[PDB]
Symmetry: D2
Subunit: 249 residues, 4 copies
């Protein structure tokens, strides 16, 4: 009785409620943002999240993301920055994670992120050590803070506990806290505490998001290389694929 | 009886109330953000705004900006992007403009902006035509939309009406609207309608903000060139100077 | 395949999401308010609402109510007001109605209500004519406004269309509108427009709510008569019973 | 240099900003609610609050109240309740108190109140002992909770420290807390902590408010006795008078 997809009703209810919560919190959600790509389930084995539901508190990798902005910011750029334009751009998204659920371990080669908790509390797991890129020298300025060790008793998704191994640092963010930056090339993940009375709602402001998603298929590329470019590297292979498409029955 | 500065009481009341409004609207304002650089008056001749006050509805160039993020995003960047890192980075700020007041005409060579109206309505004046940069070729992708002609009867600050000449396009933005992008190298300005019952509150998400302001004096530069770099070009000279410092008596 | 009850999962998800929406909107929801009495389905035949779900837009009589206050206000009252204390008291509740769903036709003999729309829009159907009370003279002051005729094409719950007959007046309320008063002894009902992108959220401030509900069973009576007193008279008999208990399987 | 009135500019700025804060917090404020009666200063000697301003943190008795509802609730009442209708009715108001400022000691003979903190924290001082009414027996049900002793170092308005003597009980309320009831015939007062970064915003839901204020002069009385009826008894005589009118120069 292992779920392999989500019913149209489960999907619509999940995403529509999330959009309303977003609107209540004053996030500018338009009609086109409420689509079949907003609700993400990272891998077939994660559809079991809808076995007991989004309020069961069980650890699964699934989340909602409403993207209000993903601007290349290529206009006005000297032609020389062309090869580096992919590290810039502006992206604004609202992320909604239910109790116990996770945005799984992954890293970006080009995208730097920042978090602003709007509702609930966010538990961020990450590697304070950045990854390297074979053959290319990289700049450094502030790097990432070390944070604290994980609190005791964190329930990880069954069959994916090892994917969190390297994300040794932990920080719990709350509404009103200073903005938190997740530099590119750093492994990161996050969840909404299982005992939370509300879904975790986080505003993410980042550089351009290269994600050839279902709702992405059908857009013009500002620069050749960008075409089909995927800037998401999930530690769990089963998470990289499902990331781009949601099975709705 | 022309004002040349703002009293400490006028300043504190202006900024503290604005911060509370910001908090009420869920913008993450920390203590360090509420300082003597938050309240901006663009030029000595604009201090007359406090002659009758921020609720008089008279046209003056003054505004409040609370910056929650100004991240260089240099970490993890290949060394080659060093000369172009200044066109990237992440900046999050809350802007508060009272009825009739303006954020004066200006343009940025490196910074691209985006607007999200949180409270009230925003009247944006801009040039759909970007400016050129002597000797350097520039990329183009989407450019700016033409918008509409100005509505009739817009009261401009006395003695600065000509600075708005080239900003022929107009767009009125409201809460819930799609994000609006102001590409770098485009002249832009905005005001809160004079008949508004509430101050205009706008969330600005942009690339790095190079502004050697009073609260800026005393920060490490991620890259040599960035040091003291000012990326703001106001059409009105009296606005470029006052931008960096507020006279509080 | 006609539903006769709601599953524990459907109930919890319905009420927990509603509570989060309420919190997002700053309504003071405590743990004890999130119980098995919050989600109301008016009659067995209305459980079919969960056949297609709360986002189907179909007309059914079901809603959520979180009560933050139900104060008798008997303390300090001269003993003579004892028999009339039941017409007073203070009650504060947040009401959440999904698209197309209704709070069914009913009237109160003692309770006067008021509505404040927090999210979405509220369509109120009511009788501008108050009902009489055999043998007892009644006071009059402002009475109810006539309002407008019903808009065309209002889909009513199947098998209960006649219960709306006498509620000839219509008013559509929005956030920011003046408070709307529903005087005692007036038939009233309301729904969230079927095409609404968000659940209707309304703050109700009224005199004491005499409702021997499931979560009510087990409270001290400030005055003898109040014990077990039910002040709700639904035009539809199938709505009076189900009002007090929700079948959760 | 003792203030005896508030300038039109000081008044408008005080009330207009407060209204905007209220709107930001989703309180339904209409145009007619933003008038010259909204800003209250309890006595000539309290105008010195505007000597240093509403953000000085000094102890003075002044506040803002926006009334969205004051419904007699007389309609549908059996004629016998006529003499007791004055203890009922519905009143909804938003109260805004700046740091260090107080709503001064007073009690109501007919009105029972309840508090819901929307922004900031509320420090309530009150007498757990109700006052008696010569010759008339009174009902009792729950009475008031004892609360805690006052915290140390509470700065009271100069020249009115004795008016707080009997208000021995203290409770600090926060957003999200259960509704707090202030029964009629109990002395009560409250302030916004002097170190608060935001004005205290509280939603008050109470029975009818008999207050022949400036904005009150010119309304029909639902019942004879109600005419000109004042249900506010301030311990400080200088507070009873100024309560009904604000001196605006
Ligand atoms: O990509 C953009 C513009 O940045 C949006 O129109 C979409 O993400 C839909 O909101
Ligand atoms: O990167 C993140 C969260 O770290 C989101 O913007 C999405 O890319 C997750 O798939
Ligand atoms: O610059 C940063 C980090 O981006 C902030 O700490 C300051 O702007 C203060 O909010
Ligand atoms: O650029 C803007 C508004 O266009 C702000 O971020 C400040 O730079 C205005 O001085
Ligand atoms: O009844 C009261 C007090 O008025 C509340 O405690 C309950 O309704 C639970 O919120
Ligand atoms: O009266 C109403 C809505 O008219 C609510 O407070 C509940 O009593 C509905 O059952
Ligand atoms: O009194 C009433 C109705 O209760 C309101 O119209 C005024 O208080 C103005 O808001
Ligand atoms: O009673 C209160 C606060 O206790 C308010 O509603 C006003 O009456 C204060 O003047
Ligand atoms: O609007 C889509 C939907 O939610 O409405 C009815 C059906 O259940 C489907 O899931
Ligand atoms: O594609 C639109 C839609 O069906 O997809 C998700 C959301 O429920 C919306 O109704
Ligand atoms: O609206 C946000 C989103 O779901 O829509 C497109 C993209 O896939 C992103 O995940
Ligand atoms: O030391 C390199 C590494 O193993 O440590 C952290 C980074 O993610 C990379 O995987
Ligand atoms: O106890 C925390 C931890 O060691 O356990 C699992 C995860 O790898 C994390 O590093
Ligand atoms: O806190 C600073 C201040 O507002 O408080 C008192 C004085 O008026 C000054 O302007
Ligand atoms: O520098 C801090 C401060 O005085 O500056 C502005 C704000 O009023 C705050 O009180
Ligand atoms: O808090 C925002 C701000 O006022 O502080 C620093 C910078 O000058 C910016 O204008
Ligand atoms: O044509 C160039 C120009 O005059 O037009 C718009 C741009 O701002 C520049 O000033
Ligand atoms: O009427 C609008 C306008 O022509 O008047 C002033 C400004 O230059 C703008 O272009
Ligand atoms: O917490 C209760 C619940 O939602 O959690 C799991 C099960 O589905 C049940 O409905
Ligand atoms: O009784 C408590 C509860 O189970 O009832 C409804 C809500 O879901 C909560 O979890
Ligand atoms: O919390 C609100 C409520 O559901 O709880 C008790 C009462 O039945 C009311 O309907
Ligand atoms: O005229 C009396 C009546 O029929 O009209 C309205 C009220 O509800 C009652 O039912
Ligand atoms: O058309 C509206 C109406 O006449 O139709 C049904 C309901 O009785 C209402 O009075
Ligand atoms: O609108 C009224 C006012 O605020 O506007 C100008 C003058 O200062 C007066 O106080
Ligand atoms: O009477 C209206 C008014 O002048 O009074 C107070 C508020 O400032 C508003 O502008
Ligand atoms: O709007 C609220 C108010 O100021 O207006 C009328 C009454 O005096 C009350 O104090
Ligand atoms: O005992 C009566 C009394 O003195 O105590 C409390 C009440 O306010 C009254 O003033
Ligand atoms: O210390 C608190 C207190 O005793 O001091 C003043 C006020 O009367 C209150 O009762
Ligand atoms: Co990421
Ligand atoms: Co700009
Ligand atoms: Co009712
Ligand atoms: Co009172």
């Amino acid at each position: 009785s292992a779920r392999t997809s989500i019913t149209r009703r489960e999907y619509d209810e999940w995403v529509r409620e999330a959009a309303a919560l977003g609107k209540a919190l004053r996030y500018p959600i338009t009609e086109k943002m409420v689509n079949d790509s907003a609700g993400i389930v990272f891998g077939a084995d994660q559809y079991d999240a809808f076995k007991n539901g989004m309020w069961s508190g069980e650890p699964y990798e699934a989340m909602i993301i409403f993207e209000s902005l993903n601007e290349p910011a290529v206009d006005g750029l000297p032609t020389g920055a062309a090869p580096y334009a992919e590290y810039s751009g502006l992206c604004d998204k609202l992320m909604i994670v239910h109790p116990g659920k996770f945005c799984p371990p992954h890293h970006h080669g080009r995208k730097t992120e920042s978090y602003e908790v709007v509702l609930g509390e966010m538990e961020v797991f990450y590697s304070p050590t950045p990854s390297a890129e074979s053959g290319v020298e990289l700049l450094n300025f502030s790097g990432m803070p070390v944070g604290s060790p994980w609190p005791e008793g964190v329930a990880l998704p069954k069959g994916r506990e090892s994917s969190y191994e390297k994300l040794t640092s932990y920080v719990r963010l709350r509404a009103g806290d200073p903005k938190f930056v997740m530099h590119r090339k750093h492994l990161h993940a996050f969840r909404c505490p299982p005992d939370s009375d509300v879904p975790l709602v986080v505003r993410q402001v980042s550089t351009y998001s290269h994600e050839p998603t279902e709702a992405a298929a059908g857009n013009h590329a500002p620069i050749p290389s960008w075409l089909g470019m995927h800037d998401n590297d999930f530690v769990s292979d089963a998470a990289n694929t499902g990331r781009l498409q949601t099975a709705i029955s």
